Amino acid sequence: GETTDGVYRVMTRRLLGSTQVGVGVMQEGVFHTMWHVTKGAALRSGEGRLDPYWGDVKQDLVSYCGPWKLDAAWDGLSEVQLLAVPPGERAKNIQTLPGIFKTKDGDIGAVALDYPAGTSGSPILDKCGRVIGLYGNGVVIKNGSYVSAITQGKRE
Amino acid sequence: DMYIERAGDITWEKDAEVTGNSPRLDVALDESGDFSLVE
Ligand SMILES: CN(C)Cc1nc(CNc2cc(Cl)cc(C(=O)NC(C)(C)CO)c2)cs1
Known part of the structure; x- marks a missing residue:
């Protein structure tokens, strides 16, 4: 493969x-x-x-194939890029400054960009090209627009 | 039955399309992994 x-x-x-x-x-x-x-x-x-x-x-x-490898983190300050891969469309970078999910267990970066559900799993990058999480789990807001967590795993 | 196709390299691209707002939202996370808005 x-x-x-x-x-x-x-x-x-x-x-x-x-x-x-x-x-x-x-x-x-x-x-x-x-x-x-x-x-x-x-x-x-x-x-x-x-x-x-x-x-x-x-x-x-x-x-x-193996355990989770991606350990980079949003620094809570700098802009990021969603490397969006929409259905039937070319890989496109979309640059944005993340918002915040405030939760009882802590704050998570959130990216406010609308794409079809099939774009779930598209990586979010820091300035060094490192994956700081995946796009595609989040919420719909008072506007009808989508907001995704920056979802990151843990390495061991 | 599910398969993967390569779509590109993972790179930061100087002069990408800059867009989106930065909302501060109050959210809950249930056992099923569903986020929801608190108010
Ligand atoms: C709750 N988790 C645990 C399971 C599920 N999560 C989803 C979320 N899917 C999704 C992903 C993305 Cl990247 C966009 C959209 C979306 O609806 N975007 C527009 C623009 C509002 C409409 O196209 C929907 C599905 S099941």
């Missing part, structure tokens, strides 16, 4: 034609996506198979 670092589309044939159900990040031989994209199912890369290794429905994260 293709183990090259980078951003990937997650596709299903189970519906009409080929449908993009989301996006993930290949890094250090591990595929990283959101749980709601795959529901923990196996994946194909060519005629290689990726099996789930870790996941958590509450964090809404899942790693394939």
Whole structure:
């Protein structure tokens, strides 16, 4: 299978034609996506198979082939880029200054950008190109617009 | 049955389209991973 670092589309044939159900990040031989994209199912890369290794429905994260690798963090100050990968459209960077999810357990960065649900799993980058989390789990606000957490896993 | 296709490199791109606001929101997180607005 293709183990090259980078951003990937997650596709299903189970519906009409080929449908993009989301996006993930290949890094250090591990595929990283959101749980709601795959529901923990196996994946194909060519005629290689990726099996789930870790996941958590509450964090809404899942790693394939190995443990979660992405440990970079929003610094709470600087702008970031959503590397958006929309269905049937080219990878596009969209630069933004994150907002905040205030929770009983702590503050999380949030990015306010509207894309189809199939863009779930698109990585969020710091100025050094490091993935500080994945886009696609969040809320709809008093306007009808989407706001996503910067969702990051833990490394061990 | 689900498959992956490469879409690109993970790079910061000088002079990308700069957009979006920065809302400060009060949210709850349930056991099922659903965020919701508190007020
Ligand atoms: C609650 N978690 C645990 C499971 C689920 N989370 C989702 C969220 N999907 C999603 C992702 C993204 Cl990146 C955008 C949208 C979205 O609706 N965006 C517009 C512009 C408002 C409409 O296209 C929806 C699905 S199930």
